[PDB]
């Protein structure tokens with residue numbers, strides 16, 4: 216799809232058979248989801264945003280279907296204010312900025 | 315133009331006699347610029363992201379040129395680590411997400 220920006224670019228994602236809304240976030244290097252359970256090993260990681268640094272759990276090679284497009288990559292889980300899809304997965308689904 | 319997201323979507327912006335590099339950020343409702351002493355009236359505000367909130371100064375009707383495209387609108391000024399071009403201005407320069 217083509218998505219304009221007069222509204223937040225929120226989309227439905229499917230992860231672990233659960234549907235969630237997430238924000239397509241070109242200003243984010245990484246994909247960060249609010250607290251949730253995911254299977255498998257994770258690693259403690261810290262990441263920084265506008266307000267400072269937080270602790271997250273890093274899960275690798277996680278399938279997410281974003282607006283019908285398949286990705287498999289790294290998903291960080293922690294106290295993000297909103298679910299965000301970052302460039303690591305935006306590139307997988309072929310997402311570009313155009314003007 | 316089309317900007318892929320293999321790397322951060324940094325572009326050159328101009329605000330008065332200051333050229334800066336800024337992120338085209340679909341995850342940002344508003345435009346947030348690094349500390350700079352702009353002329354005119356402003357109002358204090360707090361904006362939140364990963365890590366918590368920062369305090370900013372809201373200036374209205376500031377002209378900004380983004381890759382040669384003219385824009386004018388609200389800019390938030392404060393201790394952000396990166397200059398952020400948010401949706402309020404992305405729409406003005408005709409910026410969409412596509413995949």
Ligand SMILES: CCC(=O)CCC(=O)N[C@@H](Cc1ccccc1)[C@H](O)CN(C[C@@H](C)CC)S(=O)(=O)c1ccc(OC)cc1
Nearest residue numbers: 242243244263264265296341342343344361362363364396
């Ligand atoms: C390398 C570090 C990152 O990639 C961190 C991801 C991130 O927080 N991204 C921000 C933009 C940003 C980029 C670098 C450093 C600091 C911030 C994100 O794209 C926009 N943020 C809002 C997200 C998290 C959704 C809530 S923001 O905090 O910067 C923000 C918040 C409010 C706002 O307007 C009201 C504008 C921008």
